[PDB]
A paper describes a structure:
CDT is a member of the Iota family of protein toxins which also consists of two homologous toxins produced by Clostridium perfringens (the Iota toxin) and Clostridium spiroforme (C. spiroforme Transferase, CST). All three Iota toxin family members are assembled from two polypeptide chains termed the “A” subunit (CDTa, Ia, and CSTa) and “B”, subunit (CDTb, Ib, and CSTb). All three B subunits are presumed to contain five domains that are involved in regulation (D1), oligomerization (D2 and D3), and host recognition (D3’ and D4). Once proteolyzed, the mature form of CDTb forms a large heptameric, soluble structure referred to as the prepore which binds one molecule of CDTa to generate the toxic moiety, CDT.
The helical nature of the oligomeric intermediates is also observed in the model of the tetrameric intermediate which illustrates a separation of ~46 Å across the tetramer. When propagated about the asymmetric heptameric structure, this would account for a total separation of ~15 Å in the vertical dimension and ~58 Å in the horizontal direction forming a ‘lock-washer’ like structure and indicating the structural plasticity observed across the oligomerization interface is not restricted to two-dimensional space.
Numbering used by the authors:
A (entry chain C), B (entry chain D): 218 to 315, 319 to 451, 457 to 748
Write the structure that this text describes.
């Protein structure tokens, strides 16, 4: 009844109970939990509960732009777009006009690679820290170009460059937007960076863009030929970066400064998008929220949900856990003690968690006062960076098992597992996961949980590949998370062997395989 | 109960008790110091207690731009942005369009290098003056560039310049803000000066910037590529500076004028930044305040905090000492007798304090009337220039010990120290601090306090480097601040030794190692 801000949601409703139905506001009482309505909590001191240019009434009543993702309807979640550029095919011709020697390679853009390339894992995890620390944290703007169609052949051989000259470079690209907001007068600047050697800056203008870029699409819309770099001329190169690129290094591509407007609905008619900008509010959004990246094996999200300053009782903003933030940011189906995506079982024991040094130190500090020792029951403070990686394959010996192949001696008939049941061991356990399904010249992590209600009954693992290893593991009365690395190579090799030899007492649960980054092939 | 300004805070509350909670003002009764609420004090003759475009109500209540630092929520702390230019990579090419003979070198920018370059250090500090006098005081507008990748090789050999001609010069720059205020319509002028020969006046324009620069942010936001000078043409140089830059002089780069606006909350919607300027309150803030620079090893701050004219009985403005200004300007945690930043124990005996002639002589004058002989218990004066430099390493035989190398014959089981405990001396005292963790070819100072409850018992010290030195130090009943200079060299040398022989009576405390400025090299 009592109103604070210029939003129709009152002080008693801005916090502690939050529902909008048929363009009026009602409290939350768990009577319409599965009837398409969710509970929120907003700041009661700002109608713009997030850093958004929207009142929390404007953003949660449907009274806003329909191109905005409904994940931004939560008042704590801010509408925030991120545009990057995917790399498709690299063509190298020795002319400045556009004949001559020319090579062409198929390039794949990896977005979340540099964030996760400098990650090195131990065999075991100390304390309740069930995650690892990245060396550096990078957002979803940068892209790393991997050459796939690269047999043993030097790049110099296809161009025949002797002493000082070089060719010219041309590229195939995609212009993706990954955020909870739409984007209109897109003007991105972009650096073509080879380990700091920026070959050129290309700005995408507006003509080769079109005056709309909705979230979740490239400029070449889905299945289409990628846009070449001639529509605004050729990029030069010199013979220092050729053997640099040839041997181990890859070309990188980074969007530097992306400029444009947003749209606001007018009084009478259709939208107007002229007198706005996603430049005057970027820092306002980026300062109040933490930064959370979700990364499946085929797409990614990145969200900014407003958090709390702990050293500020004057700051009266809602406080949520990690899991509450993930549910109200990305959208999650709440099963009993579990969060789900549309299909992926997401948990602190089902995916891979990555934090930079500040976030890792903060959660290491916070885990100690927890009486439960879990990652997700930690309140969010303003301004941390969190990354979530879905593993490539995952089973929990439960409803979810998307494996390429099954094991040997699977005794899942159990109930003292982490999620219900668990897989018993009696003898060996075998998987022969093929060469062609896996991506060449990459790095992969096999992780699992082993529990043993015995004193010193132990297991041995063996990962047989081109870089094979044999390791010894001791489980105990508690559950043990273990991780072991291996490297992929090109597809003309044999299959991939993983063998586990136990002693019939150790129990295995929640086995996952994830990708980390690509090892550079020698060329 | 009496209102004087247009500030809702009354006459009885604009002085002697000052708290904003939930956009109302209450007196200070120290029932609420430890819940994140700081005590302040404002004018009652002017609405804007500082020279900022904010009243004391506007700036201390959250009723202002959220991009402004909360250290500027203190009404005595003025919103004052200082934008400097980081220098990253120096590339020399002999062409005009952008082939030819090129070199590329790694350069590092120091903000406070010229301010602390004229610092001459006494081994024995007279009076309570436990500090030094710099010859010159410079703000955070200038930068000095040191070239790192320097083997023995002249610049002229790599370009082969005989008589009159020369190449052109190209640069990598970043554009940081160091102040308690934001920045929008960035129009800076920056001179590229080589010992008086300004090689260019580079203007950043606005397109290569974007219309925002937050406090504490470069133009390439954190991890990116630095902005280059081809997006606005090449810069020339001539063959009088080629040997000059080669032999002794390094290029400096300083901002002269920066133009641009700030942002105000409108009546209806969002912030507006057209009808503002960071060129009119610059003189209002720079002239009413002292100029206080803080220099960590990894960033720098520069604040202008309003001071008092002591020759003015009608002027009723708040008055603070050095420490009160530091706390209210930077944000500090108060331990028992200690000011803390995030981790650094800051004091008048834990860091280096630097004053130009005006501030240093006024401090020496103020030292006589004080009965405590400490530096921080001096009232601030208008238009004073105070610089604080942290030591690179600092230990006090206490909770704070960040020395990577460790000492010998350390008996910290004592309590007659300056800060609690002290280290007893028996025989030799050794430290082998290696070449890897010290910055090559730069001037460093080993400083400490020696106290001796005996008549003439003394020590000998020895700082062994490429120049080794032995000194004789006599301590007495009081605490003695002593300092010894030394120079680092290239990493192909041996370790750095600091040794001292005592006589079993001398006591040592508060040992620090700081750095003053870089030295030119033979080339
Ligand atoms: Ca309200
Ligand atoms: Ca609100
Ligand atoms: Ca299970
Ligand atoms: Ca007033
Ligand atoms: Ca006032
Ligand atoms: Ca001490």
């Amino acid at each position: 009844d009592l109103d604070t801000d210029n939003d129709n949601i009152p002080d008693s409703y801005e916090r502690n109970g939050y529902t909008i139905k048929d363009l009026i506001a009602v409290k939350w009482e768990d009577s319409f939990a599965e009837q398409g309505y969710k509970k929120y909590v907003s700041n009661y001191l700002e109608s713009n509960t997030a850093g958004d240019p929207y009142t929390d009434y404007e953003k949660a009543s449907g009274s806003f732009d329909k191109a905005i993702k409904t994940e931004a309807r939560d008042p704590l979640v801010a509408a925030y777009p991120i545009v990057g550029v995917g790399m498709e095919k690299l063509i190298i011709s020795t002319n400045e006009h556009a004949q001559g020697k020319t090579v062409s390679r198929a390039t794949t853009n990896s977005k979340t690679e540099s964030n996760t390339a400098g990650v090195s894992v131990n065999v075991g995890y100390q304390n309740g820290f069930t995650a690892n620390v990245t060396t550096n944290y990078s957002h979803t703007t940068d892209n790393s170009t991997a050459v796939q169609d690269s047999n043993g052949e030097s790049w110099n051989t296809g161009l025949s460059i002797n002493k000082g000259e070089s060719a010219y470079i041309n590229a195939n690209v995609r212009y993706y937007n990954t955020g909870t907001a739409p984007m209109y007068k897109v003007t991105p600047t972009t650096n073509l960076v080879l380990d700091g050697d920026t070959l050129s800056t290309i700005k995408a203008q507006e003509n080769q863009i079109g005056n709309n870029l909705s979230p979740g699409d490239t400029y070449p819309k889905k299945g289409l030929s990628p846009l070449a770099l001639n529509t605004s001329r050729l990029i030069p190169i010199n013979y220092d970066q050729l053997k640099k690129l040839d041997a181990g290094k890859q070309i990188k591509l980074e969007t530097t400064q992306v400029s444009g407007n947003f749209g606001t609905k007018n009084s009478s008619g259709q939208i107007v998008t002229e007198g706005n900008s996603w430049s005057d509010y970027i820092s306002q959004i980026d300062s109040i929220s933490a930064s959370i990246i979700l990364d499946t094996e085929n797409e990614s999200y990145e969200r900014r949900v407003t958090a709390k300053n702990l050293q500020d009782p004057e700051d009266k903003t809602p406080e949520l856990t990690i899991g509450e933030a993930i549910e109200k940011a990305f959208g999650a189906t709440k099963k009993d003690g579990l969060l789900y995506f549309n299909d992926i079982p997401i948990d602190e024991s089902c995916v891979e968690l990555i934090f930079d040094d500040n976030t890792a130190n903060k959660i290491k500090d916070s885990l100690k006062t927890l009486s439960d020792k879990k990652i997700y029951n930690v309140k969010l403070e303003r301004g941390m960076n969190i990354l979530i990686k879905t593993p490539t394959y995952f089973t929990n010996f439960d409803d979810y098992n998307n494996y390429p192949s099954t094991w040997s001696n699977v005794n899942t008939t159990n109930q003292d597992g982490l999620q219900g049941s668990a897989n018993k061991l009696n003898g060996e356990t075998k998987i022969k996961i093929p060469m062609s399904e896996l991506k060449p010249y990459k790095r992969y992590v096999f992780s699992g949980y082993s529990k043993d209600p015995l004193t010193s009954n132990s297991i041995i693992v063996k990962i047989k590949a081109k870089e094979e290893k044999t390791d010894y593991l001791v489980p105990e009365q508690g559950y043990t998370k273990f991780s072991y690395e291996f490297e992929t190579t090109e597809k003309d090799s044999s299959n991939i062997e993983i063998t586990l030899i136990g002693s019939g007492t150790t129990y295995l649960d929640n086995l996952s395989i994830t990708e980390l980054n690509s090892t550079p092939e020698i060329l």
